[PDB]
Amino acid sequence: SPQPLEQIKLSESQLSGRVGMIEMDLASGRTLTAWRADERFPMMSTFKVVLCGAVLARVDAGDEQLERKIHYRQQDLVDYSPVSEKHLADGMTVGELCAAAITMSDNSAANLLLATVGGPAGLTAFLRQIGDNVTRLDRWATELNEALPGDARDTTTPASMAATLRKLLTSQRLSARSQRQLLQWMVDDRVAGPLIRSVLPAGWFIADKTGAGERGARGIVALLGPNNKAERIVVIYLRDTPASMAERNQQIAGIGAALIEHWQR
Ligand SMILES: OC[C@H]1O[C@H](O[C@H]2[C@H](O)[C@@H](O)[C@H](OCCCCCCC3CCCCC3)O[C@@H]2CO)[C@H](O)[C@@H](O)[C@@H]1O
């Protein structure tokens, strides 16, 4: 593979889309690669990580419990509810809802949690509280992936999302237990985690959340590093490409290959 920045450029040429990317040291915040890092991209389902950061903040404050059982109804369900559709009779805990949202991309779970933090406006207020003045959520889980040209709703930037993830995971805004929980949810992603491990060389750590939307939108927030360590945050978003899902996945993977082959920078 070529150098990361050359590979990112090649991905734009091949996809005819915009790529946004940051590579950042998790422990320090050192930015290593940046590309379109202040441009806006739809978050898609990557928002579910920040959502559960907001939930954990409420837990830390004594305003929520991960144990608390929420008993919802079939009319509450939205498209793609692989876990939540199974628990109409018995409900799910707040922690189970976060696990379903992050590890399975369960949309009803996400919406149930989103209302607990005050909806899109409440999650946006939480982002402002932690010093992210850019990321914004405007819609609910099944409408926020529309990725209309020119539409600022439901967007982040690579730089903002990376900084926000670092804040949630490491800055002691969340309690130690909550930081550990958020990280474990990402480690446990079932949608892409096992597939990524299947193509990573031995020794490379992965934790992640992916997203997909219209007009080719695709993204991943991840922790990656050699020696089985979460050394770096990597955030990659794609927008405005007509390419197949397979090709969008392959281009993201190719950026990953470039980082892996050329890690010491
Ligand atoms: O010299 C480094 C390595 O180079 C190759 O590894 C290949 C690997 O066989 C392939 O499957 C992967 O594809 C990349 C798959 C990446 C998956 C997604 C990455 C994510 C992670 C972070 C968020 C953005 C994207 O490339 C690497 C690097 O060339 C060799 O196979 C391996 O034995 C050697 O250790």
Numbering used by the authors: 26 to 238, 240 to 252, 254 to 292
How do the authors describe this structure?
Lastly, we changed the position of the ester bond, shortening the tail, and replaced the terminal carboxylate group with an amine group to result in PSR-3-226. PSR-3-226 was also not able to be trapped in the wt SHV-β-lactamase; we suspect that the tail of PSR-3-226 is not capable of forming a trans-enamine stabilizing U-shaped conformation. This prompted us to use the deacylation-deficient E166A variant of SHV-1 as we had done previously with difficult to capture compounds. Fo-Fc and 2Fo-Fc electron maps and subsequent crystallographic refinement indicated the presence of a covalently-bound partial PSR-3-226 fragment (refined at 100% occupancy) and a nearby HEPES buffer molecule fragment (refined at 80% occupancy). The PSR-3-226 inhibitor fragment, which consists of six atoms, was covalently bound to S70 in a trans-enamine conformation (torsion angle of 175°). Since only six atoms of the inhibitor fragment were able to be resolved, there were few hydrogen bonds observed in the active site; the inhibitor carbonyl oxygen occupied the oxyanion hole, as in SA2-13- and PSR-4-157-bound SHV-1, within hydrogen bonding distance of the mainchain nitrogens of residues A237 and S70. The one exception was residue 166, which was substituted to an alanine from glutamate to capture the inhibitor intermediate. This E166A change resulted in a local distortion of the main chain for this residue similar to what we observed previously for deacylation-deficient E166A inhibitor complexes.
Bacteria harboring β-lactamase enzymes [E.C. 3.5.2.6] pose a significant threat to public health. These enzymes prevent β-lactam antibiotics from reaching their intended target, the penicillin binding proteins (PBPs). Sulbactam, tazobactam and clavulanic acid are mechanism-based inactivators as they share similarities with the β-lactam structure, the normal substrate for β-lactamases. Similar to a substrate, these inhibitors can, after acylation at catalytic residue S70, undergo several inhibitory reaction pathways including fragmentation in the active site and covalently cross-linking at S130.
